[PDB]
RNA sequence: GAGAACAGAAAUCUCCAGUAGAACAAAGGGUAAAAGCCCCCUUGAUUUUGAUUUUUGUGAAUACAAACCAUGAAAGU
RNA sequence: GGUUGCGGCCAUAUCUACCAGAAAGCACCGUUUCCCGUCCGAUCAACUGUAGUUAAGCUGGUAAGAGCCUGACCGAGUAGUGUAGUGGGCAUACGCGAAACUCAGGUGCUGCAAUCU
């Protein structure tokens, strides 16, 4: 029985990790900006590595978060690229799931060699009503075991809506 | 005399064996936990070795 | 420990010094620890305390200021005041004694019975 | 595990629940203490869903004491059934508790506001209750900064705007806009308001209503308390477990 | 720890555990809605009057009142 | 007796697993014009308690559970220790006197105000 113990989507984070910093980052900027409607966030490097070719504080990625109907709409238009076929993995233990796409032009947006091509990673966090207890300030607490999301519940919800497969 | 002392020492040995059994079950599962933790620690410090990581400065 | 702040300390009261590690401010006096002194003046933030410190073979008088967090009320005079009040009551009753203290006296005569407690003889 | 549990150091119970902040509490309760007794009084405002709380507390080693306490459920008696948690309603509750305490002290004193855990934001209902109390006449220290309509771009304030907020102007203009733009959300969010058919001038007059009423009788007409103690106790013990 | 295209042991993203094992000028005390990181505003690291401890010489720290000030809604600092 | 708010003492309260919770409240939850802040009304800010839920949180019981606390004719008058002797080659005499461990028992107590079938 599930009157309020459903499994709604909470949010989707779309991320673009670039090998270099500059107008390439600004272009990936622009891509996620146009896809979401809102302004994205530029993420810097934590530490220098010198084999990936970067340094501390270099602005080496850009990402964005989306909540609401927009999130699942973009999710479906992206999963069309993966044609509704994920793996047994790509589902976390705690009940979240994500994938990655090359050739972002495979959802609506055209080639436009003005800018080039980028790939991006979708990650999608799931929950139920009542997550506010671990997110508010006053009254903070944690959620019970029975109400915890899980890989099995998410995979069943996914073999349900979007009507997909597991592929191994 | 041999009748009396052997039931008394046998009851006491029963107490001794119960004590020992109990302590050894507890320390056995404790040892298993610590050994698995030790192996996990060794496996993670095996892959951290590939990272250059001068521990001193700030990187 | 908020009960270490709702603690009135009037001039005259006696207090022990026991400074806790949890407050870096005003950690006083390395050997003024477990030592008792009465309070002479009080300000905000503050209490006064005087101690008779001995140097050579004379007791000189060191006055000091401390945060309230370190000081503590002394139970030094509890039995003294209890005995004084009881002495007033006993003096009133006499007016209507050995109110003084006395060490432990030798226990007096008595009788020990054998009803169910027969003495149990034994050996090494 | 055993060692982690043993080396664990638990905080205070009231902190383990997200209920108090001893950092702020000590700065509040701690006195000058050159002056000895001089009990320090603090007005405690709290917002739950469906209800507001305003109290005036002294604290002592007994643990604390409540000389005066009011809530928003009293305001139906004073002329408003609706919107108990809003800005104007908390303002009314603050004026109520202020006139109450001033009546009991017989003067018409100095009380320090407790914010709780709520964030300090321009246009907050805690500052609405502050203005209600200062209305009532208790001298509390404050600044005109955080009242709404405070133009963040400079150091000035418009009194007419927070006057409208006191009268319920934002809810009224939103009522008007949502009404002349739609009726789905209107019928959903204003069912009692719809059955009552109240006006903007209406609702301002009702708040004036209630203001004069609390100025008339702030003496805490208490609840009627049906089904006295033993009834409640036995019926609750029917459903209370026991070892 | 689990998880996400190129991306691997370390590039960025998300979730769970995590009393401190991190940081605060290397095995130690103290600090977790902080004494830590980020953000907002400032530059009380300011003058005058006396008091205490370390110490007869000062300096150091300490509390204490009046002013000019900063800060926060405030208690207060 | 239940609950809410403010607290005191700060694990007998904490951790883990399961279960129950009529009513009351609390809580999730509904919405985003304004006050406000967010990459993102998720947090924070505001509005109506209306759409609806005890699923969660919270409260209480349960476990030859972990830990935490109390006690012991528990250890034990033991170890250790002050004093004396032309005592032996460590005991005796007058005296003081533990802790760990083990065992047993327990698993929050309370103040102020308000409120509830």
From Swiss-Prot, chain A:
Subcellular location as annotated: Cytoplasm; Nucleus
What InterPro entries does this protein map onto? Ribosomal_uL5, Ribosomal_uL5_C, Ribosomal_uL5_CS, Ribosomal_uL5_dom_sf, Ribosomal_uL5_N
Q: Which GO terms describe its biological process?
A: cytoplasmic translation; ribosomal large subunit assembly; translation
Which residues does the record list as N6,N6,N6-trimethyllysine (modified residue)?
70
Any one GO MF annotation of this record = rRNA binding
Q: Which PROSITE patterns match?
A: RIBOSOMAL_L5 (PS00358)
Database matches in Gene3D superfamilies: 3.30.1440.10
- Matches recorded under Pfam families: Ribosomal_L5, Ribosomal_L5_C
Q: Which UniProt keywords apply?
A: Acetylation, Cytoplasm, Methylation, Nucleus, Ribonucleoprotein, Ribosomal protein, RNA-binding, rRNA-binding
User: Main localisation, per the record?
Assistant: cytoplasm
Q: How is it modified after translation?
A: N-terminally acetylated by acetyltransferase NatA.
The organism's place on the tree of life at top rank: Eukaryota
**Gene Ontology CC annotations of this record:** cytosol; cytosolic large ribosomal subunit; nucleus
Q: What does this protein do?
A: Component of the ribosome, a large ribonucleoprotein complex responsible for the synthesis of proteins in the cell. The small ribosomal subunit (SSU) binds messenger RNAs (mRNAs) and translates the encoded message by selecting cognate aminoacyl-transfer RNA (tRNA) molecules. The large subunit (LSU) contains the ribosomal catalytic site termed the peptidyl transferase center (PTC), which catalyzes the formation of peptide bonds, thereby polymerizing the amino acids delivered by tRNAs into a polypeptide chain.
Q: Which family does it belong to?
A: Belongs to the universal ribosomal protein uL5 family.
One further remark on this entry is: Present with 39000 molecules/cell in log phase SD medium.
- Name the chain's protein: Large ribosomal subunit protein uL5A
Q: Which gene encodes it?
A: RPL11A
Swiss-Prot record, chain B:
Basic residues bias locations: 37-53
The molecule here is called: rRNA-processing protein CGR1
Q: Which residues form a coiled coil?
A: 1-46
Region Disordered: which residues? 21-59
Expression induction or repression: In response to cytotoxic stress but not genotoxic stress.
The similarity comment for this entry is: Belongs to the CGR1 family.
- The domain of life is Eukaryota
Anything else of interest in the record?
A: Present with 2340 molecules/cell in log phase SD medium.
Q: In which compartments does the protein localize? A: Nucleus, Nucleolus
Q: What does this protein do?
A: Involved in nucleolar integrity and required for processing of the pre-rRNA for the 60S ribosome subunit.
> Composition bias, kind Basic and acidic residues: at what positions?
21-36
Species this protein is from: Saccharomyces cerevisiae (strain ATCC 204508 / S288c) (Baker's yeast)
Swiss-Prot record, chain C:
**Which keywords label this protein?**
Cytoplasm, Isopeptide bond, Ribonucleoprotein, Ribosomal protein, Ubl conjugation
Biological processes, Gene Ontology terms: cytoplasmic translation
One GO MF term on file is: structural constituent of ribosome
Assign the protein's first listed, main location to one coarse class.
cytoplasm
Compartments in which it is found: Cytoplasm
Ligase as a keyword of this entry, yes or no, is no
| Location in chain, cross-link Glycyl lysine isopeptide (Lys-Gly) (interchain with G-Cter in ubiquitin) | 7
Give the CC-aspect GO terms: cytosol; cytosolic large ribosomal subunit
Function text: Component of the ribosome, a large ribonucleoprotein complex responsible for the synthesis of proteins in the cell. The small ribosomal subunit (SSU) binds messenger RNAs (mRNAs) and translates the encoded message by selecting cognate aminoacyl-transfer RNA (tRNA) molecules. The large subunit (LSU) contains the ribosomal catalytic site termed the peptidyl transferase center (PTC), which catalyzes the formation of peptide bonds, thereby polymerizing the amino acids delivered by tRNAs into a polypeptide chain.
What is noted besides the main data? Answer: There are 2 genes for eL21 in yeast.
Quaternary structure?
Component of the large ribosomal subunit (LSU). Mature yeast ribosomes consist of a small (40S) and a large (60S) subunit. The 40S small subunit contains 1 molecule of ribosomal RNA (18S rRNA) and 33 different proteins (encoded by 57 genes). The large 60S subunit contains 3 rRNA molecules (25S, 5.8S and 5S rRNA) and 46 different proteins (encoded by 81 genes).
| Family membership | Belongs to the eukaryotic ribosomal protein eL21 family.
Identify this protein by name: Large ribosomal subunit protein eL21A
Its gene?
RPL21A
Please tell me where this chain falls within the complete protein, as first and last residue plus total length: 26 to 153 of 160
Swiss-Prot record, chain D:
Q: List the disulfide bonds.
A: none
**What's the main place this protein lives?**
cytoplasm
Q: Which InterPro entries does the record match to this protein? A: Rbsml_uL18_euk (IPR005485), Ribosomal_uL18_C_euk (IPR025607)
Q: Name one Pfam family in it.
A: Ribosomal_L5e
Swiss-Prot/TrEMBL keywords: Cytoplasm, Isopeptide bond, Nucleus, Phosphoprotein, Ribonucleoprotein, Ribosomal protein, RNA-binding, rRNA-binding, Ubl conjugation
Give GO terms for biological process: cytoplasmic translation; ribosomal large subunit assembly
Could you tell me which SUPFAM superfamilies the record lists for this protein? Translational machinery components (SSF53137)
Q: Where is this cross-link: Glycyl lysine isopeptide (Lys-Gly) (interchain with G-Cter in ubiquitin)?
A: 131
Which GO-annotated molecular functions does the record name?
5S rRNA binding; structural constituent of ribosome
GO cellular component terms, alphabetically, are: cytoplasm; cytosol; cytosolic large ribosomal subunit; nucleus
Give the location in the cell: Cytoplasm; Nucleus
Taxonomically, the superkingdom here is Eukaryota
List of residues that carry Phosphoserine: 134, 143, 202
Task performed by this protein:
Component of the ribosome, a large ribonucleoprotein complex responsible for the synthesis of proteins in the cell. The small ribosomal subunit (SSU) binds messenger RNAs (mRNAs) and translates the encoded message by selecting cognate aminoacyl-transfer RNA (tRNA) molecules. The large subunit (LSU) contains the ribosomal catalytic site termed the peptidyl transferase center (PTC), which catalyzes the formation of peptide bonds, thereby polymerizing the amino acids delivered by tRNAs into a polypeptide chain.
Q: Which HAMAP family match?
A: Ribosomal_uL18_A
Question: Which protein family is it in?
Answer: Belongs to the universal ribosomal protein uL18 family.
Q: What is this protein called?
A: Large ribosomal subunit protein uL18
């Amino acid at each position: 029985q599930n009157p309020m113990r459903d499994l709604k989507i909470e949010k989707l984070v779309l991320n673009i990790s670039v090998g270099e910093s500059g107008d390439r980052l600004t272009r990936a900027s622009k891509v996620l900006e146009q896809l979401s409607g809102q302004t994205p966030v530029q993420s810097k490097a934590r530490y220098t590595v010198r084999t990936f070719g970067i340094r501390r504080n270099e602005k080496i990625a850009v990402h964005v978060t989306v909540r609401g109907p927009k999130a699942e709409e973009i999710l479906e238009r992206g999963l069309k690229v993966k044609e509704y076929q994920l793996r047994d993995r790509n589902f976390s233990a705690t009940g979240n799931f994500g994938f990655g796409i090359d050739e972002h032009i495979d959802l609506g947006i055209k080639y436009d060699p003005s800018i080039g091509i980028f790939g991006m990673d979708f990650y999608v966090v799931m929950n139920r009503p009542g997550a506010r207890v671990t997110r508010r300030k006053r009254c903070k607490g944690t959620v019970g075991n029975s109400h915890k999301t899980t890989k099995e519940d998410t995979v069943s919800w996914f073999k349900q809506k979007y009507d997909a497969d597991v592929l191994d | 005399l041999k009748a009396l002392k052997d039931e008394k020492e046998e009851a006491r040995q029963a107490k001794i064996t119960m004590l020992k059994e109990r302590r050894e079950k507890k320390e056995e599962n404790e040892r298993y936990e610590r050994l698995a933790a030790k192996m996990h620690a060794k496996k993670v410090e095996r892959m951290r070795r590939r990272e250059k990581r001068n521990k001193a400065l700030k990187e | 420990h908020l009960s270490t702040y709702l603690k009135v300390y009037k001039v005259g009261d006696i207090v022990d010094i026991k400074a806790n590690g949890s407050i870096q401010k005003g950690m006083p006096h390395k050997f003024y620890q477990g030592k008792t002194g009465v309070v002479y003046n009080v300000t905000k933030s503050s209490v006064g305390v005087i101690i008779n410190k001995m140097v050579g073979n004379r007791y000189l008088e060191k006055r000091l200021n401390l945060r309230v967090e370190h000081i503590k009320h002394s139970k030094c005079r509890q039995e003294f005041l209890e005995r004084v009040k009881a002495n007033a009551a006993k003096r009133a009753e006499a007016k209507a004694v050995q109110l003084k203290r006395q060490p432990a006296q030798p226990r007096e005569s008595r009788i020990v019975s054998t009803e169910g407690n027969v003495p149990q003889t034994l050996a090494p | 595990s055993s060692a982690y549990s043993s080396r664990f150091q638990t905080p205070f119970r009231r902190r383990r629940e997200g209920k108090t902040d001893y950092y702020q509490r000590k700065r509040l309760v701690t006195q000058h203490k050159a002056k000895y007794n001089t009990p320090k009084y603090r007005l405690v405002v709290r917002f739950t869903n469906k209800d507001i709380i305003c109290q005036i507390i002294s604290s002592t080693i007994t643990g604390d004491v409540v000389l005066a306490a009011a809530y928003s459920h009293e305001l139906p008696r004073y002329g408003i059934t609706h919107g108990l948690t809003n800005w104007a309603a908390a303002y009314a509750t603050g004026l109520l508790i202020a006139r109450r305490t001033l009546q009991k002290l017989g003067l018409d004193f100095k009380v320090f506001l407790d914010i709780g855990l709520q964030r300090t934001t321009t246009g907050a209902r805690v500052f609405g209750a502050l203005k209600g109390a200062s209305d009532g006449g208790l001298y509390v220290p404050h600044s005109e900064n955080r009242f709404p309509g405070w133009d963040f771009e400079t150091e000035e304030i418009d009194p007419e705007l927070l006057r409208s907020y006191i009268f319920g102007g934002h809810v009224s203009q939103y009522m008007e806009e949502l009404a002349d733009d739609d009726e789905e959300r209107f019928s959903e969010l204003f069912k009692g308001y719809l059955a009552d058919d109240i006006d903007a001038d209406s609702l301002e007059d009702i708040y004036t209503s209630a203001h004069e009423a609390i100025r008339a009788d702030p003496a805490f007409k208490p609840t009627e308390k049906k089904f006295t103690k033993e009834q409640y106790a036995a019926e609750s013990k029917k459903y209370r477990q026991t070892k």
